[PDB]
Design a protein around this ligand. Structure first.
Ligand code: HIZ
Ligand code: BOG
Length: 334
């Protein structure tokens, strides 16, 4: 039935968790996190107690979005939920939400440490990012903030996409410019930036501020062509682009000296200024770069995700009751 809970003071609050979660050890103070050992499954886990989840309409709305999103994500290369619990026995005593996931003690920076990786290692890591992206994108979700710190990787370089949200170095140029109709290929831009860095051992676009970032990008990809200029709604944006000194797109072979030509080719297809022209995640997985990994029969797709439900304007007690239903309805994975 209901598990037996135990109480323990941790992170300046009294945590109340199932007996199955042992040796809680704080690893951070959105919400505070402890590392634990799950005696039921035999896994090391991260247990997150949400901070102030139902303090305001906004916090309530965010708690619900976060829970619904994590419950929906069921893929090897994306973070998922091992468990969700509340010590509450009713809606009326319900106030705290805890989320449980695989403990991931390293991100892509922790494993890569500014060093060149081998080409075979890059194929495996990027393959996994694109396999997870195919799945996220198939749900009609855009990550919007893919970077090394949002990618968990175990010592065996098995990788999961996360969202915890220099922080600007992997952002698509349109995002830097506050465009308002992004497509999924904003994430593909980020993947190109990550991929370039893994190969070379160096940040591709290490901008010092917002405008320097755009400057570095344009130096590599070129100033916008006529086709792209035709798609610019903003009269000021237009005027500005028209007064630029046309630089040709650099040749990526003379930037990524030494690299597998297949890698250089993929990067050319990812880092195209015009978002409409960037390769998609599904296309990228079929690219010859990934021949040793690609398997069309095990690159699964998600059920559709309804984002209008979290975009409602509801009362706190309404979001709290809806979040409660989500807690109670959780079914752990096999
Ligand atoms: N700061 C916590 C500490 O980790 C502990 C923990 C424990 C249990 C459950 C979750 C996290 C954290 C890190 S990552 C995360 N949440 C998401 O990444 N959500 C999310 C949103 C949109 C997406 F598209 C995807 Cl792919 C993922 N929260
Ligand atoms: C200073 C020049 C910056 C380059 C302009 C960004 C081009 C990005 O590409 C643009 O993406 C938009 C956002 O989804 C789409 O609506 C457009 O169709 C697409 O061309």
């Amino acid at each position: 039935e209901r598990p037996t809970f135990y109480r323990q003071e941790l992170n300046k609050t009294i945590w109340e968790v199932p007996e199955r979660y042992q040796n809680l050890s704080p690893v951070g103070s959105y919400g505070s996190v402890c590392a634990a050992f799950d005696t039921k499954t035999g896994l090391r886990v991260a247990v997150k107690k949400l901070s102030r989840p139902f303090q305001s309409i906004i916090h309530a709305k965010r708690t619900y979005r976060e829970l619904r999103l994590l419950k929906h994500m069921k893929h090897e290369n994306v973070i998922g939920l091992l468990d969700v619990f509340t010590p509450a026995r009713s809606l009326e005593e319900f106030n705290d939400v805890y989320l449980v996931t695989h403990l991931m003690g390293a991100d892509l920076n922790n494993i890569v440490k500014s060093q060149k990786l081998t080409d075979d290692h890059v194929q495996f890591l990027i393959y996994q990012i694109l396999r997870g992206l195919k799945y996220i994108h198939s749900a009609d979700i855009i990550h919007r903030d893919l970077k090394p710190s949002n990618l968990a990787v175990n010592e065996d370089s098995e990788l999961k996409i996360l969202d915890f949200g220099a922080t600007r170095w992997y952002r698509a140029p349109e995002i830097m410019l506050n465009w308002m109709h992004y497509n999924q290929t904003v994430d593909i831009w980020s993947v190109g930036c990550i991929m370039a860095e893994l190969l070379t051992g160096r940040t591709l676009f290490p901008g010092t501020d917002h405008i320097d970032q755009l400057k570095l990008i344009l130096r590599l990809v070129g100033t916008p062509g006529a086709e792209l200029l035709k798609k610019i709604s903003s009269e000021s944006a237009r005027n500005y682009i028209q007064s630029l000194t046309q630089m040709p797109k650099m040749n990526f072979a003379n930037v990524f000296i030494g690299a597998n030509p297949l890698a250089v080719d993929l990067l050319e297809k990812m880092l195209v200024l015009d978002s409409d022209k960037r390769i998609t995640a599904a296309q990228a997985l079929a690219h010859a770069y990934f021949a040793q990994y690609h398997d069309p029969d095990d690159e699964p797709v998600a059920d559709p995700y309804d984002q209008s439900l979290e975009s409602r304007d509801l009362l706190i007690d309404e979001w709290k009751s809806l979040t409660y239903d989500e807690v109670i309805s959780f079914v752990p994975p096999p």
